[PDB]
Coordinates of C-alpha atoms in Angstrom, one line a residue:
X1 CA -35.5 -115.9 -62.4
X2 CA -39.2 -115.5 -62.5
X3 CA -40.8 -117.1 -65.6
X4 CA -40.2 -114.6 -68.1
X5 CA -40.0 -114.1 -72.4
X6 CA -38.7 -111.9 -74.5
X7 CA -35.5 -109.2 -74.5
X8 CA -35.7 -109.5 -70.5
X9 CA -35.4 -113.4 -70.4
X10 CA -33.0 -112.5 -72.9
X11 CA -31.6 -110.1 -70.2
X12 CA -31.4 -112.0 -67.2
X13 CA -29.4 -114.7 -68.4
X14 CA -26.6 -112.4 -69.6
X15 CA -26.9 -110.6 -66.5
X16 CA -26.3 -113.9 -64.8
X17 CA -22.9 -114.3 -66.9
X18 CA -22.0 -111.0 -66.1
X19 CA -18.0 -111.2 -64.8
X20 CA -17.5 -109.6 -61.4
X21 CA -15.0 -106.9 -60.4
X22 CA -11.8 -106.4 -58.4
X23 CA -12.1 -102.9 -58.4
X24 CA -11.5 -101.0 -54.5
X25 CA -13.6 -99.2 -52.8
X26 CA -13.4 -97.8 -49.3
X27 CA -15.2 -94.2 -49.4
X28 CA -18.5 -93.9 -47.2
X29 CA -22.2 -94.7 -48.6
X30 CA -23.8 -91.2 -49.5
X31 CA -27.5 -92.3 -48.7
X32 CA -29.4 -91.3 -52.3
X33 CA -32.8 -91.6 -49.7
X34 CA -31.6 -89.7 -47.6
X35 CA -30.3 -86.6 -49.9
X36 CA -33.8 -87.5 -51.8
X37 CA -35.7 -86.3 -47.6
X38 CA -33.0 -83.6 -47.2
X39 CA -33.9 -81.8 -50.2
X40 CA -37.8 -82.3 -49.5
X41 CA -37.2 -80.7 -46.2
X42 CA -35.6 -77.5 -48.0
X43 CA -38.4 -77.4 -50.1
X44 CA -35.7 -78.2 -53.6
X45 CA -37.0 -80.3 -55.9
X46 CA -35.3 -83.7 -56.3
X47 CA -34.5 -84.7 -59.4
X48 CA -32.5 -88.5 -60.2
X49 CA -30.4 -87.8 -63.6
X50 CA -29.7 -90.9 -65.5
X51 CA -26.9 -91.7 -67.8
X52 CA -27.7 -94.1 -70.6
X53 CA -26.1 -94.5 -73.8
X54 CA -28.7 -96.2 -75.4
X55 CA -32.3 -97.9 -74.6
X56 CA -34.9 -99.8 -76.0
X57 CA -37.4 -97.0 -75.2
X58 CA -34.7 -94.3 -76.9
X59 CA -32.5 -93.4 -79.5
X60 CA -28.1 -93.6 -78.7
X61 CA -26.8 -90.6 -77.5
X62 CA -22.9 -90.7 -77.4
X63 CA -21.7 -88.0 -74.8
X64 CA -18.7 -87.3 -72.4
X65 CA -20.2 -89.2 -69.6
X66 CA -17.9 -86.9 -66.9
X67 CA -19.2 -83.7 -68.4
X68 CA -22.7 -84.8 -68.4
X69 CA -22.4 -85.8 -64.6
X70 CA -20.2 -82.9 -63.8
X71 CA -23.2 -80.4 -64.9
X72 CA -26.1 -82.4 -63.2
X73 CA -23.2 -82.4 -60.0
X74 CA -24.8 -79.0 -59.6
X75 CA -28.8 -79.8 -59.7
X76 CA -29.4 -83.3 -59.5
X77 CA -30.0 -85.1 -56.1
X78 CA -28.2 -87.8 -57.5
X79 CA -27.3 -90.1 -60.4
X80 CA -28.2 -93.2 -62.1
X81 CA -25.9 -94.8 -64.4
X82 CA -27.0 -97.7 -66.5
X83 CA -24.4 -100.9 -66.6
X84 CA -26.1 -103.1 -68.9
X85 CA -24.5 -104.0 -71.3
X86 CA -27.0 -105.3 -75.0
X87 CA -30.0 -103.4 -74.2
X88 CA -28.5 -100.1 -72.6
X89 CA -25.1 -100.3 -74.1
X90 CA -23.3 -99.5 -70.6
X91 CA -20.5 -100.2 -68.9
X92 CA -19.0 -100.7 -65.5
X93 CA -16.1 -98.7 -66.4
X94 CA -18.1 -95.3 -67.4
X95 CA -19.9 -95.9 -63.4
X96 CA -16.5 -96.1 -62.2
X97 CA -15.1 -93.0 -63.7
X98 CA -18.4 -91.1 -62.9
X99 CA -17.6 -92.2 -58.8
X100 CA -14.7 -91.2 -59.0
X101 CA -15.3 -87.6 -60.3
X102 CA -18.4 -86.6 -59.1
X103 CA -19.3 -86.1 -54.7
X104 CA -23.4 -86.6 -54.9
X105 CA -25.0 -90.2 -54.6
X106 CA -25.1 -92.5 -57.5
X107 CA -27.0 -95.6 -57.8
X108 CA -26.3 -98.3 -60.4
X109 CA -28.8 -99.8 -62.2
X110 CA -29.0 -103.0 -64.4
X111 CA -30.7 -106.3 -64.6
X112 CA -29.3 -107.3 -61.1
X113 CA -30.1 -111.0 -60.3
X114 CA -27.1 -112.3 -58.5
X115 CA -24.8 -110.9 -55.3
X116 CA -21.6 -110.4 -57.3
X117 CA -23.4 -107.2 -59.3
X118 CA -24.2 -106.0 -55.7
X119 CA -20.0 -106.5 -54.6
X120 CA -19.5 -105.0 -58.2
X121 CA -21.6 -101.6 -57.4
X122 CA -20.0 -101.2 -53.9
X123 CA -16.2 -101.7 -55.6
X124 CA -17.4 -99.8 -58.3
X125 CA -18.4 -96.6 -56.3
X126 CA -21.9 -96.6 -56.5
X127 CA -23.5 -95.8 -53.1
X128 CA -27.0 -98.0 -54.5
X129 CA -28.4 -100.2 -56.5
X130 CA -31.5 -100.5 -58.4
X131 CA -33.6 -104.0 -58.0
X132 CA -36.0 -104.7 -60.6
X133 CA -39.1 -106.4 -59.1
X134 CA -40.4 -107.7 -62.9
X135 CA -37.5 -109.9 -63.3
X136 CA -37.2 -111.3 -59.6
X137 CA -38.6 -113.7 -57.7
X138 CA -40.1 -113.2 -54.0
X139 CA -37.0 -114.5 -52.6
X140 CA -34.0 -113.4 -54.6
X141 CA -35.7 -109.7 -54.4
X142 CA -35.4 -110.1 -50.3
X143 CA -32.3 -111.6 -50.1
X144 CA -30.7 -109.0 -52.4
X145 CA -31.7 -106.3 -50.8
X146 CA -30.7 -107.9 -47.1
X147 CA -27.3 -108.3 -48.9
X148 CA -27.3 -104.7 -50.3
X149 CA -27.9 -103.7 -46.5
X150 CA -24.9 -105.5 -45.1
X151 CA -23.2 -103.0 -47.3
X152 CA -25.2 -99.9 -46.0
X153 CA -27.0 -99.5 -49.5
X154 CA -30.9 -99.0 -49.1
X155 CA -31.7 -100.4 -52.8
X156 CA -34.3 -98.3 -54.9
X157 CA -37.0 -101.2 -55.6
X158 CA -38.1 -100.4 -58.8
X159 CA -42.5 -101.9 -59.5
X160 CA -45.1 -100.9 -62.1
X161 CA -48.0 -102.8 -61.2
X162 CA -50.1 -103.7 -57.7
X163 CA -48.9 -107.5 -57.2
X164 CA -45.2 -105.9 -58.0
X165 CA -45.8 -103.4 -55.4
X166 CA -47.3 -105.5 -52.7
X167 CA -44.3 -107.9 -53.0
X168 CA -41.4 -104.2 -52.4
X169 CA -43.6 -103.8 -49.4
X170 CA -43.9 -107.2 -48.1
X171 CA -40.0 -107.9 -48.3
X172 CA -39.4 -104.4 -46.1
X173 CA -38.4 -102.1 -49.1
X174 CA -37.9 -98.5 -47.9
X175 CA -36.6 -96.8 -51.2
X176 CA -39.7 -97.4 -53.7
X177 CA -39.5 -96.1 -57.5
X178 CA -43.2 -95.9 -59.2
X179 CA -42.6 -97.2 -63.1
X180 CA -44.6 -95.5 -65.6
X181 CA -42.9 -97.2 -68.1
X182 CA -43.4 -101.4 -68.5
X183 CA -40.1 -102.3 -69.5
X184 CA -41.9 -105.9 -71.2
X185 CA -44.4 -103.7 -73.8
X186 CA -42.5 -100.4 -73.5
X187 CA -46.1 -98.9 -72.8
X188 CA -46.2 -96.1 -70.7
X189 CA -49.2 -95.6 -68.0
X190 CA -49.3 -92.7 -66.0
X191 CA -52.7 -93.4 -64.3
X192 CA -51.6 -97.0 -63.0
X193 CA -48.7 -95.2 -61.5
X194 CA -50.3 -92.1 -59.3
X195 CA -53.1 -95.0 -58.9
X196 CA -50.0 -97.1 -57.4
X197 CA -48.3 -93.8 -55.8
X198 CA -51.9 -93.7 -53.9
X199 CA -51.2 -96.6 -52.0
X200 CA -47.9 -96.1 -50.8
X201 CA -47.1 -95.5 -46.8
X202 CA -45.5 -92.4 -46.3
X203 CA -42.8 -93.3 -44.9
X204 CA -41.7 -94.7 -48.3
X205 CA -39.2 -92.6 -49.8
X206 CA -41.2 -92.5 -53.2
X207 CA -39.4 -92.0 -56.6
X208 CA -41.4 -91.8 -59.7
X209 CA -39.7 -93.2 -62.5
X210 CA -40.3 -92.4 -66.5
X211 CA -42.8 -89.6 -68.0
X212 CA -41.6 -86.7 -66.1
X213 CA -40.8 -83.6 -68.8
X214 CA -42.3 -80.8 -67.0
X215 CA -42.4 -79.2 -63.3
X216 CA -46.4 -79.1 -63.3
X217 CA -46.5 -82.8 -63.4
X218 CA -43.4 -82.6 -60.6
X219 CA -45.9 -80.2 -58.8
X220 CA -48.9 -82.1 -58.9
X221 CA -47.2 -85.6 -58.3
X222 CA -45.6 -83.8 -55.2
X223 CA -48.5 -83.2 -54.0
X224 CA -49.6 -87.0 -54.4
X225 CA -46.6 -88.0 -52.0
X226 CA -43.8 -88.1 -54.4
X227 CA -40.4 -87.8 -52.8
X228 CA -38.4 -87.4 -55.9
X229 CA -38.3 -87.9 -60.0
X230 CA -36.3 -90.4 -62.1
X231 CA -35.7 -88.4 -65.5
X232 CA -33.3 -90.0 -68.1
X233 CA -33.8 -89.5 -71.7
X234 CA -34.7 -85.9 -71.7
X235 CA -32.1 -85.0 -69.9
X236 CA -29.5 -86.8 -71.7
X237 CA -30.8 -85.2 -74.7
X238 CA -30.8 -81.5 -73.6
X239 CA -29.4 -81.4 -69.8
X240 CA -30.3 -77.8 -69.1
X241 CA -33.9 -79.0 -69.4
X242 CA -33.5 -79.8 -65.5
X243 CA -33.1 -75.9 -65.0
X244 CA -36.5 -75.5 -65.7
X245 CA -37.8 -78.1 -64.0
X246 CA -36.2 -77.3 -60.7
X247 CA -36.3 -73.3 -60.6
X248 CA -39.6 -73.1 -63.1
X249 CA -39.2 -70.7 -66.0
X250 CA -39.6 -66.9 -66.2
X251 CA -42.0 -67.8 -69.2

């Protein structure tokens, strides 16, 4: 519900037509920001897996959603499953079987503009949600994430740009995900986003989000404050890629 064109006004208003769920749900909140500080403090690299069918920035890749999150059950610090259904082809159905199977934290992301999506993550199983500042106003973005608290979620606020980014900070965000990628020209900048890393407190739990495809970038963004890395595409593509990027290679 800002002013907004294109595929994500297109977006939005589905999202806003989106039916809610009567699923159940009772099982405790595993903290994704928290596994994300427990795994910097062992010195593993954190790696967020996503599951997408499709994507405007990709190609459709149809895969056994369990097997895919059984294997990254053993590397990844957690999930992210896409919901959305036009652009991302998803469904709240695959997050729910993935819940169910799978014990590390999974955060559900889609073009979240009303409470209901939030009540349809926690029934769902998801133990986050994803809140897209580009599509948000000021005040749905705060009261959203105060709602998401209630539940004991700690939403990953997802920005790309500085007015973005001031706004995550102003409305107390905690959980902060650094887009490479804007999602409106499907460009990717990788200097506006360490430029944006830069300014980050650092007590933010700091996930950067698109371009990762090798661990000297994870290195060197490390480094810059990075907490942990949001890596979809590749990975759904070839998952043992996140061998490599989590133990290095022997060459």
């Amino acid at each position: 519900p800002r002013y907004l064109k294109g595929w994500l006004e297109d977006v939005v208003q589905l999202s806003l037509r989106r039916p809610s769920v009567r699923a159940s749900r009772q099982r405790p909140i595993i903290s994704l920001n928290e596994r994300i500080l427990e795994f910097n403090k062992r010195n593993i690299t954190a790696i967020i897996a996503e599951y997408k069918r499709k994507s405007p920035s990709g190609l459709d890749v149809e895969r056994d959603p369990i097997e895919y999150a059984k294997f990254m059950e053993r590397y990844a610090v957690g999930l992210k499953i896409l919901t959305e259904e036009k652009y991302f082809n998803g469904s709240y159905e695959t997050l729910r079987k993935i819940a169910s199977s799978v014990s590390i934290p999974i955060a559900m992301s889609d073009a979240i503009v009303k409470e209901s999506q939030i009540d349809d993550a926690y029934n769902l199983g998801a133990d986050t949600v994803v809140l897209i500042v580009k599509i948000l106003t000021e005040r749905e973005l705060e009261s959203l994430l105060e709602y998401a608290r209630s539940y004991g979620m700690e939403p990953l606020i997802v920005i790309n740009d500085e007015n973005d980014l001031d706004i995550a900070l102003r409305i107390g965000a905690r959980f902060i995900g650094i887009e490479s990628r804007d999602w409106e020209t499907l460009e990717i900048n990788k200097e506006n986003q360490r430029k944006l890393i830069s300014m980050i407190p650092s007590n933010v739990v700091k996930v950067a989000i698109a371009g990762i495809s090798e661990r000297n970038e994870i290195e060197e963004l490390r480094k810059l404050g990075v907490n942990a890395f949001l890596i979809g595409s590749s990975l759904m593509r070839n998952p043992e890629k996140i061998k490599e990027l989590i133990e290095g290679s022997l060459e």
